[PDB]
Design an enzyme around this catalytic site. Structure first.
Site, PDB file in Angstrom:
ATOM      1  N   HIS B  41       0.818  -1.212   0.000  1.00 47.90           N
ATOM      2  CA  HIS B  41       0.000   0.000   0.000  1.00 47.90           C
ATOM      3  C   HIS B  41       0.859   1.272   0.000  1.00 47.90           C
ATOM      4  O   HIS B  41       0.302   2.366   0.004  1.00 47.90           O
ATOM      5  CB  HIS B  41      -0.994   0.030   1.170  1.00 47.90           C
ATOM      6  CG  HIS B  41      -0.364   0.227   2.511  1.00 47.90           C
ATOM      7  ND1 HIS B  41      -0.295  -0.775   3.453  1.00 47.90           N
ATOM      8  CD2 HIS B  41       0.182   1.326   3.089  1.00 47.90           C
ATOM      9  CE1 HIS B  41       0.276  -0.304   4.550  1.00 47.90           C
ATOM     10  NE2 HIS B  41       0.586   0.967   4.352  1.00 47.90           N
ATOM     11  N   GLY B 143       3.390   5.697   9.523  1.00 49.61           N
ATOM     12  CA  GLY B 143       4.752   5.554   9.071  1.00 49.61           C
ATOM     13  C   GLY B 143       5.463   4.334   9.609  1.00 49.61           C
ATOM     14  O   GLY B 143       6.621   4.093   9.241  1.00 49.61           O
ATOM     15  N   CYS B 145       4.500   1.216   9.156  1.00 50.81           N
ATOM     16  CA  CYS B 145       4.314   0.036   8.331  1.00 50.81           C
ATOM     17  C   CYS B 145       5.649  -0.394   7.729  1.00 50.81           C
ATOM     18  O   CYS B 145       6.547   0.412   7.454  1.00 50.81           O
ATOM     19  CB  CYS B 145       3.280   0.284   7.220  1.00 50.81           C
ATOM     20  SG  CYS B 145       1.679   0.553   7.931  1.00 50.81           S
TER      21      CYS B 145
HETATM   22  C1  LIG Z   1       1.102   2.223   7.930  1.00 52.94           C
HETATM   23  O1  LIG Z   1       2.232   3.038   8.215  1.00 52.94           O
HETATM   24  C2  LIG Z   1      -0.141   2.553   8.816  1.00 52.94           C
HETATM   25  C3  LIG Z   1       0.123   2.198  10.274  1.00 52.94           C
HETATM   26  C4  LIG Z   1      -1.103   2.475  11.154  1.00 52.94           C
HETATM   27  C5  LIG Z   1      -0.744   2.243  12.622  1.00 52.94           C
HETATM   28  C6  LIG Z   1      -1.707   3.856  10.971  1.00 52.94           C
HETATM   29  N1  LIG Z   1      -1.300   1.869   8.248  1.00 52.94           N
HETATM   30  C7  LIG Z   1      -2.091   2.391   7.300  1.00 52.94           C
HETATM   31  O2  LIG Z   1      -1.966   3.540   6.898  1.00 52.94           O
HETATM   32  C8  LIG Z   1      -3.184   1.527   6.717  1.00 52.94           C
HETATM   33  C9  LIG Z   1      -3.178   1.605   5.209  1.00 52.94           C
HETATM   34  C10 LIG Z   1      -4.277   0.762   4.562  1.00 52.94           C
HETATM   35  C11 LIG Z   1      -4.386   1.050   3.064  1.00 52.94           C
HETATM   36  C12 LIG Z   1      -4.052  -0.730   4.787  1.00 52.94           C
HETATM   37  N2  LIG Z   1      -4.515   1.852   7.164  1.00 52.94           N
HETATM   38  C13 LIG Z   1      -4.910   1.576   8.397  1.00 52.94           C
HETATM   39  O3  LIG Z   1      -4.267   0.841   9.164  1.00 52.94           O
HETATM   40  C14 LIG Z   1      -6.219   2.178   8.854  1.00 52.94           C
HETATM   41  C15 LIG Z   1      -5.879   3.193   9.948  1.00 52.94           C
HETATM   42  C16 LIG Z   1      -7.047   4.055  10.382  1.00 52.94           C
HETATM   43  C17 LIG Z   1      -6.497   5.215  11.218  1.00 52.94           C
HETATM   44  C18 LIG Z   1      -7.829   4.619   9.201  1.00 52.94           C
HETATM   45  N3  LIG Z   1      -7.059   1.146   9.374  1.00 52.94           N
HETATM   46  C19 LIG Z   1      -8.112   0.695   8.686  1.00 52.94           C
HETATM   47  O4  LIG Z   1      -8.461   1.127   7.593  1.00 52.94           O
HETATM   48  O5  LIG Z   1      -8.849  -0.357   9.334  1.00 52.94           O
HETATM   49  C20 LIG Z   1     -10.050  -0.868   8.728  1.00 52.94           C
HETATM   50  C21 LIG Z   1     -11.242   0.002   9.070  1.00 52.94           C
HETATM   51  C22 LIG Z   1     -11.613   1.028   8.203  1.00 52.94           C
HETATM   52  C23 LIG Z   1     -12.719   1.807   8.498  1.00 52.94           C
HETATM   53  C24 LIG Z   1     -13.451   1.571   9.653  1.00 52.94           C
HETATM   54  C25 LIG Z   1     -13.053   0.571  10.528  1.00 52.94           C
HETATM   55  C26 LIG Z   1     -11.953  -0.218  10.224  1.00 52.94           C
END
Ligand SMILES: *[C@H](O)[C@H](CC(C)C)NC(=O)[C@H](CC(C)C)NC(=O)[C@H](CC(C)C)NC(=O)OCc1ccccc1
Ligand SMILES: *[C@H](O)[C@H](CC(C)C)NC(=O)[C@H](CC(C)C)NC(=O)[C@H](CC(C)C)NC(=O)OCc1ccccc1
Ligand SMILES: [Cl-]
EC number: 3.4.19.12
Lengths: 306, 302
Positions: B41, B143, B145
């Site tokens: 991603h 950041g 990931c």
């Molecule tokens: C990577 O650096 C980062 C680390 C996290 C600790 C923030 N992850 C992401 O940015 C990741 C990218 C996606 C495309 C896989 N997204 C998420 O982890 C995201 C974080 C929240 C803050 C939006 N989680 C997520 O989308 O979980 C599923 C979800 C979505 C909507 C409602 C409930 C659950």
């Protein structure tokens, strides 16, 4: 988000760990430039660990009596001296992996990472606090002496602890890298006991701020307290007095979260007087006091070490 | 003596961490030989992400759209490819610090160390367990990931985890180093939730043996139980079932301490039904389940 008991990356320290053998006894040493630091009790004998004359025991030793091994590489000892409870062994080879370092003597309530080692080999890393009674609650077996505790800043490794002994109750005592013990302990097997272990109040408040940052808010209330009135309650639960200096260093966390220090003190007072009522804070049923205000900011802001 | 949540030394892994940037998204990569691994991603755009089609998004990408930094040094990408949920970036420099390593798939209940990183640099190290619901309770910010989890055995770094996402309640999900998720999750910002968390029963029992070895024995009692009757209690307290294989795995700790496994189960049953009555075990007021039986043997004995 999330909050864990987090150690520093240990790579810089792993490159300084060596094995020191004197006779039958093997323990760990710290190789910085052309000097290996290790606990002096490596020169002790089986029947002389109660009143060892270390001065007399060392002068009768020679450089070759110290076998120093860096992984599979032997280091020739070409000089030996005593500094308090640690031995400074001079080697002809300067450690190519020596990091930017300094020796520091930490204060009670401050935290550091321990790199547990055996036979010069790093075995594990974990976070520790210097207790108010100048012991630490670590994990150390026979052969772990010479393992070090440290902090990292930017690229500079601050060594603050070297492990020497365990007191009954499973608590651990050691020296700074100048060789002076934390607390009143001595490196001989005569009866010694640690003093009162109080709770580090400023660290508990920092951890409560970490909880709020990470979503746990159930303990916040609409009360406030004076510092005076909080300390009167604290003393009754064997908590350290909270001082103005502690209020100051909690400032940044208070500003980031919008919760005044004395409002968090009111929450802590309630928790002390009424318990958690079956709830938990950051996965704990007890109030955690082994995170400093800086530890919290460090982890929640993601500072890295180059 | 003493018993602490202990991580592996992180130095062998630190030497493998690099920064990967695509567009305005930055995360960490794992530099092994001449290949850098990172979550796919990294190639999403801010206003996509809800439902990215990764094949479509790769249509545009060229090698030079992937900026890889090892510390200050800049690595040149000479090829890229997608495998499951990870990218494989071929670079022109083999990592001279590459350790002996392998990629392993761990199972729920097993533990590993995480080296949390940002911009390819280490922040800290801590010990995690793969929960029964295939999440981990970590400490990860944006950041982070590409941060990896690992074990170290003899001289081999066994990489088992790469971080991809956080679900609400601060729970974390990721993949193995082949790119396949642990659990039912997908690398897409659509609504997802982990199954309700349960307690790793075999690990609690191992930790109770650690407590005995370290001098805490107030919870030993005169009762015994059957595997069936214990599991009736386990189920009501949201503990995972204890199997005969688990009993077998606890054998060596039972022989070291002289406490039969079903006798420790009777102790655990009494703790579940009555609490600790104001006492602690290894400094904890809660029953700890992130130590495996192997973890206990390792820490209490070499
Ligand atoms: C990577 O650096 C980062 C680390 C996290 C600790 C923030 N992850 C992401 O940015 C990741 C990218 C996606 C495309 C896989 N997204 C998420 O982890 C995201 C974080 C929240 C803050 C939006 N989680 C997520 O989308 O979980 C599923 C979800 C979505 C909507 C409602 C409930 C659950
Ligand atoms: C070094 O590897 C080792 C690590 C410990 C975790 C065992 N330390 C020692 O062997 C150390 C050597 C002495 C000469 C400094 N001795 C102790 O730590 C010793 C261990 C006990 C279990 C025998 N403890 C000790 O001497 O404490 C003082 C004491 C003596 C008698 C009664 C109470 C307290
Ligand atoms: Cl607890």
């Amino acid at each position: 988000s999330g909050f864990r008991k987090m150690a520093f990356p240990s790579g810089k320290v792993e490159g300084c760990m060596v094995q020191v053998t004197c006779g039958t006894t093997t323990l760990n040493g710290l190789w910085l430039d052309d000097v290996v630091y290790c606990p002096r009790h490596v020169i002790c004998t089986s029947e002389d660990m109660l009143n060892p004359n270390y001065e007399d025991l060392l002068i009768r030793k020679s450089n070759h009596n110290f076998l120093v091994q860096a992984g599979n590489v032997q280091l020739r000892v070409i000089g030996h001296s005593m500094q308090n409870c640690v031995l400074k062994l001079k080697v002809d080879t300067a450690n190519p992996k020596t990091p930017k370092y300094k020796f520091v003597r930490i204060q009670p309530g401050q935290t550091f990472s321990v790199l547990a080692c055996y036979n010069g080999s790093p075995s594990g890393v974990y976070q520790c606090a210097m207790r108010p009674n100048f012991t630490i609650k670590g994990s150390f077996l026979n052969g772990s002496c010479g393992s070090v505790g440290f902090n990292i800043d930017y690229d500079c490794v601050s060594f603050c602890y070297m492990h020497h002994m365990e007191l009954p109750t499973g608590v651990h005592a050691g020296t700074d890298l100048e060789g002076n013990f934390y607390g009143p302990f001595v490196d001989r097997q005569t009866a010694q006991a640690a003093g009162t272990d109080t709770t580090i109040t400023v660290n508990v408040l920092a951890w409560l701020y970490a909880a709020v940052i990470n979503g746990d808010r159930w303990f916040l209330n609409r009360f406030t307290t004076t510092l005076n009135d909080f300390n009167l309650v604290a003393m009754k639960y064997n908590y350290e007095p909270l001082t103005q200096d502690h209020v100051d260093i909690l400032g940044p966390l208070s500003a980031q979260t919008g919760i005044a220090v004395l409002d968090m003190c009111a929450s802590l007072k309630e928790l002390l007087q009424n318990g958690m009522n079956g709830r938990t804070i950051l996965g704990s049923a007890l109030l955690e006091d082994e995170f400093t205000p800086f530890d919290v900011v460090r982890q929640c802001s993601g500072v890295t070490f180059q």
